[PDB]
Design a protein around this ligand. Sequence first.
Ligand code: HEM
Ligand code: HEM
Lengths: 436, 436
Amino acid sequence: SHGLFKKLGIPGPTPLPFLGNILSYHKGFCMFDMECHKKYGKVWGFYDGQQPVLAITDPDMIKTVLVKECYSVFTNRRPFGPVGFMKSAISIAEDEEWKRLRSLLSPTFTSGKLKEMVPIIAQYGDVLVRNLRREAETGKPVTLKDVFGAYSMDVITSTSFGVNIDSLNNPQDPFVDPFFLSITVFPFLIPILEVLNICVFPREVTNFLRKSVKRMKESDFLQLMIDSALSDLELVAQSIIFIFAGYETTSSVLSFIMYELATHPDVQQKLQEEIDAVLPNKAPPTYDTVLQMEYLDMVVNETLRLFPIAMRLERVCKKDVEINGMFIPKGVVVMIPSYALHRDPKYWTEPEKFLPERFSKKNKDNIDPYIYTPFGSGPRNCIGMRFALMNMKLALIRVLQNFSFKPCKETQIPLKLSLGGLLQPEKPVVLKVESR
Amino acid sequence: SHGLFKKLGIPGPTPLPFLGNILSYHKGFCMFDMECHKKYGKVWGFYDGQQPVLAITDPDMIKTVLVKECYSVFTNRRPFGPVGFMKSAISIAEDEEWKRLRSLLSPTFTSGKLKEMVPIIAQYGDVLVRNLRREAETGKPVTLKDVFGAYSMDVITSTSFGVNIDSLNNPQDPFVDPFFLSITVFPFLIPILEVLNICVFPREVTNFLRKSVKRMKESDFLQLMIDSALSDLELVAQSIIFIFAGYETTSSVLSFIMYELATHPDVQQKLQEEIDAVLPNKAPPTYDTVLQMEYLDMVVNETLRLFPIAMRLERVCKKDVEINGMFIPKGVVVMIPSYALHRDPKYWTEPEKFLPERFSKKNKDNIDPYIYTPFGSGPRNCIGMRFALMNMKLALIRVLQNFSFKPCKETQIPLKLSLGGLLQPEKPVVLKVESR
Ligand code: HEM
Ligand code: HEM
């Protein structure tokens, strides 16, 4: 079906047999979407192997796909690799099976349940200072992904189950393209690996959590789920997605934020002045305190514009439909390039620069909510959106109250992204930390 | 999932790993269903490899599966082998795709369109006498599947497209378990054969018909289809099912009928007296003439009771449902053993005997329409039901008007069925033919 986009009148790169357009991923995932958006315009198509993928940039077509016709056509994402038992994961699940998981897990991410976890995750904000006060008084560059990754991992274990550890102080068992590139080009190898108990995840784990959730089902995220019903294998499958999310997401974004604050001291100083103004004399941050700091929100929102760790938003077309005046055949994965839309002169002035004033209450009104979608949109959006921003800002407040950040001789200026498809820096961010 | 029927409280034979219960098919398809119906009762389950199959015998549960909840749950049959392009076949098609094919092909099998083909198929009733008058005046046993197979094949070509041939007189190009046993046990090999252009059918054919239907689409079943729209590959796919049906079905049933008439001369004499009474002095048969002969219908209906060439009626359970007080999980193929229901003392007296008076207008009322389903039931039933009985009876009238049938020294008495799963005799039926 390599002539589908050419028989529909949709431009795009010429695909190769079997391979399709995956050879154009040598520059990276984001560079491929920006080049295709530059030479093809608002709509183009390419092939991930034999699978056709359609990209859209029009805000009305994106609104129709993600918000309007979500339950009817664009309900699921594309199926990937051997999932093993993980089929029941809310993000892997499809159709009405997901609608039950989305509903049974929606109360866990409410405006009231989030405030319950504020006194818990604020404790690790004090622990992060202790590990910082040790790596700052030692007076030498510090790798941010380790300290932030430890904070995020301890926040996960306490808010998911309630296990209080110090992932940085006890580094003995803190839990935690080849095989799969051939999987995308050869989708007919997925069922064979499923019948052989082979999973993309290291399947020998999971059974740890499958048996770790035993003393808890006899006497946070977990307590607010079993009480009602969810299965035992489902309950472990959902907790694996909650760990994979809150770890790599919170760790990578915080490292991206501290890079911009260290490379723009005018933004870090203005942010530290607002934090000290709302919280005088290193006051503890509360739920209502975080929702008040607007410049802190402007810094978080602008960094997510530059580095949306999702990169892409994918939806599977369930039936032959016609949205906003164009036909889409059944089986085509409709992709929304979030990275390419965030760095486009059509909607952003100086898209390569870091200007937090783009999200000021005066300028936040002239921003299309479907061009800037770091958490997706519609029913299939990020269920842990409000939980993520609260955990990151609570860490940002406690960190900036005691320390400042300056670049180092090893700091990569400018910063280069990873060559893979994790949206992490090429080299781990290292900065100089000084105590106030 | 070899413990599904044991965790639901459903009896059945103990399955083996990978194989399941296919090793119990050494006796045959029909003998396996009759033994399971004898020792397990009204409901049992077995495994065709890793696929669970549930068998039902209750008339209300069969009515619910085939008639009531057909469009909602029991819409499709099980998927079989690499279909290639034949996916679009009305019998292979599934869900709304079939509902369009069933509707676009329904007018071709109406009470009015059938009468148009009566003067056409009555012509080959005269040709069958000529081939009979040759093989009867030669005074020697005649193989019935060859002469009837020639009649059925010429009736197909004339009513489908309009090509008048004599498949018995011109035997030079009259058109027309290993590979697949491993396919049932290993369903994960189907997609690999699809991507290699490999089909269960000899794929090098079809393209003949794909190009044979070229002079007709520029200037019967075919004319009543294109006029409206159906695709070109669909149009050839539907004609292949129409040929496979009207050939093996008409040929095998007619051979089964003439075996019973030759082994029960009291039935053949009574049938010949009714044919000569309705049609005096070898009169030509019409559409209204066939619908009048009731004993001819009693002979055809009783033979279809003994030899229902379908054997099984299969439906795929689309969702978790509960019919008549029992739960059926999603993905289970619900099978209706038509052969076992036809030879059951619960509904039939002397089920091994051939008694045409079971379908008399006095006795036809006390017969459950869901125990006797030679053409299925509901929306997914045989679309060529009324077309089949008209073609067979029109041949039965013209044959019995000129010749009688007696057994031979090679005639297998009693008759043994084939060891495979085609419901044909083990040895081809041969009888002695005499001219009246
Ligand atoms: C900086 C942090 C995060 C970002 C930027 C982010 C972003 C996203 C995005 C873009 C999507 C796809 C939306 C779509 O396809 O329409 C998504 C889905 C999802 N996220 Fe996150 N997320 C973050 C943190 C989290 C956290 C902390 C959790 C859970 C504790 C979480 C759980 C999920 C789930 C379950 C889905 C799939 C929902 C579904 O398929 O219906 N995420 N997220
Ligand atoms: C003695 C002759 C025949 C017998 C006993 C017979 C019997 C059957 C049976 C039992 C079914 C399955 C019903 C079900 O699953 O509910 C079926 C389906 C079907 N038959 Fe026949 N049939 C005969 C002749 C024909 C002819 C002559 C044609 C076409 C010209 C035909 C076309 C079909 C089709 C297309 C289906 C599938 C319908 C669907 O899937 O919706 N059959 N038949």
